[PDB]
């Protein structure tokens, strides 16, 4: 109701509501270590927040008080805490209770409190009908907000949602192919979906992502989840790979190819392929490559795996 | 800023 | 440039005195400004700007100590600050009731962090309640919460626990099994470490897995050789100049720690290029006020000051103590807890 910046606004201290309920101070001893300073508003609120608390008046007031104290601290997770106590004790609307915590997220979208409480609601409803929406808008102001991917992750699986979600992630790749938080999202839904052992999902998806390389060869996310979705079978098994990568080097060259093609070099000699000398000399050829001129800044790493590759396959 | 908590 | 050591020491002692309502939104983590402010003072040798006796008695009143009838045991630990209205105890009586006072598994860690880099011995410390909460904590599936009451959950909170039970030098704290499971399926595809499985890898969580499994001393039982390449591979390729937190992200300062730190119990932190990485991190120092920030430009805070010192410190910057990398105290402190460690075994 009554708004902290309202020009009418009264402390609690003045408000007769309030004149049975004794403040409780806070108190940080002889020498406070890291002391906030607070206002004569901050100060008054809370000072009656630890007064209903500390007496678990599960109040009407006590509910509209959290709201003040939000307001003041959204990161308080006792007061998030208390306030669902008291949604549950005064059986509020938690309907109502969704659109109040959609506007606070969208105001404070990092915020942890606000997001584990919307999550609360949702399983208390056991209604996720409005969340991958709600989730689509955060992620417009930040489409890699951690705390909005794994909030819909949770919803996805929760209520097993994934029948439109490989559509989602193919459109947000369009916006931003480089967006590494889409790109693991693509591995969950398929994962978690008809999985990479269907031949025609793994070529599906092989052949997607190189199509998505050829739009922008350096782009490390699509470099690792082309590796990691083979990585796991063999690289050395794909034959055609091999041969399709060597021929991209000379127009869509990047550090990351180079790495992919030591990788599947290492994968035959770990598999005692044919030429095992002729093979690591490959190898070693191309980790100079990288230290030398491909990814510099990586120079005593690449020289450090050539010294591996040589100490264990000679 | 980070927010870790 | 150059390293502004003494402006940083001011910029750390600031911190403990007091702070704009502005960082109101800390409140409740005052004990890990705490923490980042002492453990930086500690770092760059000069505690002895502050009185280790008055902040311990500080410390210890945040302690949530079992009441008489112990029916409290299971929310035992340390509190982030005073700011239930609890009165100030240095944990010299019994614990006093109350409906919603417990303690933080963050503020535990980083509490018995401060009262060791500050010379304490925790014998104040009720060692079982506090181990006795921590497991209060662990879910199903390994991970932990941050409070009794109820929270997300993730790996942020698995180092924690860990850090606790390797300061109390006790693992009755957690079910290790099952942390290590979570540790385990936390592991993206593209080989970094998630905060939970599924989720995007990221650099602050696969410090918190590798650097969990480090203080365990189950590294190498947990991954294989070929993991732990992977997962190298996976950490080394954050170094653009500083380093990022995730493939396609603007490096941070906090992440030459967070990341560095990792490569660092990897064993190949030797393998990066140094003065990049010192170059971009010293390029977000705060040469008025001291500190450092996340980018350059910007304003410095706490967590950035501190991890960018220790981002230095794993550099072996002149004038930093070498941080423990798995525990995140300095090594100077690291011992001063094996002898603690040893005493008590008597
Ligand atoms: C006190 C102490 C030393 C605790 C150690 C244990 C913890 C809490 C570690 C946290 C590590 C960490 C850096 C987690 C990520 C934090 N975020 C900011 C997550 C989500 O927000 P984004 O803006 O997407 O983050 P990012 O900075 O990764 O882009
Ligand atoms: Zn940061």
Redesign the pocket.
């Known amino acids: 109701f009554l708004s902290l910046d309202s020009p009418t606004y009264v402390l609690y201290r003045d408000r007769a509501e309030w004149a049975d309920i004794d403040p409780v101070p806070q108190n940080d001893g002889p020498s406070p270590v890291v002391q906030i300073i607070y206002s004569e508003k901050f100060r008054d609120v809370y000072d009656y927040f630890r007064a209903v608390l500390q007496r678990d008046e599960r109040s009407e007031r006590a509910f509209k008080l959290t709201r003040d104290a939000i307001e003041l601290n959204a990161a308080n997770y006792t007061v998030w805490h208390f306030r669902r106590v008291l949604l549950r004790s005064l059986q509020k609307d938690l309907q109502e209770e969704m659109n109040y915590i959609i506007a606070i997220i969208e105001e404070q979208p990092?915020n942890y409190q606000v997001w584990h409480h919307r999550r609360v609601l949702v399983e208390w409803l056991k209604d996720p009908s409005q969340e991958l929406e709600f989730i689509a808008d955060i992620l417009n102001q930040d489409a890699?907000?951690?705390?909005a991917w794994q909030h819909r992750q949770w919803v996805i699986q929760e209520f097993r949602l994934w029948d439109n979600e490989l559509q989602y992630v193919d459109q947000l790749l369009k916006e931003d192919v480089r967006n590494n938080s889409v790109w693991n999202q693509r591995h969950f839904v398929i994962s978690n979906t008809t999985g990479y052992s269907d031949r025609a999902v793994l070529e599906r998806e092989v052949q997607y992502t190189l199509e998505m390389i050829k739009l922008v060869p350096h782009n490390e996310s699509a470099w690792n989840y082309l590796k990691g979705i083979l990585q796991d079978r063999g690289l050395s098994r794909y034959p055609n790979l091999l041969n399709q990568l060597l021929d991209l080097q000379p127009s869509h060259s990047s550090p990351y190819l180079i790495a992919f093609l030591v990788d599947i070099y290492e994968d035959m000699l770990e598999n005692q392929c044919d030429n095992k000398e002729d093979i690591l000399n490959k190898a070693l050829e191309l980790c100079e490559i990288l230290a030398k001129e491909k990814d510099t800044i990586r120079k005593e790493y690449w020289r450090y795996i050539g010294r591996s590759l040589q100490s264990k396959h000679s | 800023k980070?927010?870790?908590? | 440039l150059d390293f502004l050591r003494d402006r940083h020491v001011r910029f750390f002692q600031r911190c403990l005195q007091v702070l704009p309502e502005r960082y109101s939104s800390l409140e409740t983590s005052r004990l890990?400004i705490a923490?980042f402010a002492l453990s930086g003072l500690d770092m760059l040798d000069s505690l002895d700007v502050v009185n280790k006796d008055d902040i311990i008695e500080w410390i210890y009143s945040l302690q949530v100590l079992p009441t008489e009838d112990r029916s409290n045991l299971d929310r035992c630990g340390f509190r982030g600050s005073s700011y239930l209205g609890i009165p100030f105890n240095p944990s010299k009586n019994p614990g006093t009731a109350h409906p919603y006072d417990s303690g933080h598994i963050?503020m535990t860690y980083?509490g018995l962090s401060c009262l060791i880099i500050l010379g304490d011995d925790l014998s104040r410390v009720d060692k079982e309640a506090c181990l006795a909460g921590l497991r209060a904590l662990q879910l199903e599936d390994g991970s932990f919460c941050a409070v009794p009451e109820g929270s997300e959950n993730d790996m942020?909170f698995v180092?924690?626990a860990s850090c606790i039970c390797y300061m109390l030098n006790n693992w009755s704290g957690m079910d290790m099994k099952k942390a290590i499971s979570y540790i385990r399926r936390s592991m993206s595809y593209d080989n970094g470490l998630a905060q939970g499985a599924g989720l995007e890898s990221?650099g602050?969580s696969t410090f918190?897995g590798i650097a969990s499994l480090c203080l365990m001393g189950k590294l190498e039982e947990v991954f294989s050789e070929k993991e732990l390449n992977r997962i190298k591979r996976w950490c080394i390729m954050r170094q653009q100049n500083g380093y990022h937190?995730?493939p396609n992200?603007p490096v941070?300062t906090?992440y030459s720690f967070?990341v560095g730190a990792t490569l660092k119990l990897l064993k190949i932190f030797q393998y990066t290029n140094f003065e990049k990485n010192r170059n971009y991190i010293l390029s977000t120092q705060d040469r008025l006020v001291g500190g450092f920030a996340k980018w350059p430009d910007s304003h410095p805070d706490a967590l950035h000051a501190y991890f960018g010192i220790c981002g230095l410190s794993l550099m072996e910057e002149s004038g930093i103590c070498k941080v423990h990398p798995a525990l995140?105290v300095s090594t100077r402190t690291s011992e001063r807890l094996r002898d603690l460690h040893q005493s008590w075994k008597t």
């Open positions: 990092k890699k907000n951690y705390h | 980070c927010v870790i908590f | 890990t923490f963050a980083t942020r180092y924690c990221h602050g918190c937190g995730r992200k941070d906090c967070w995140n």
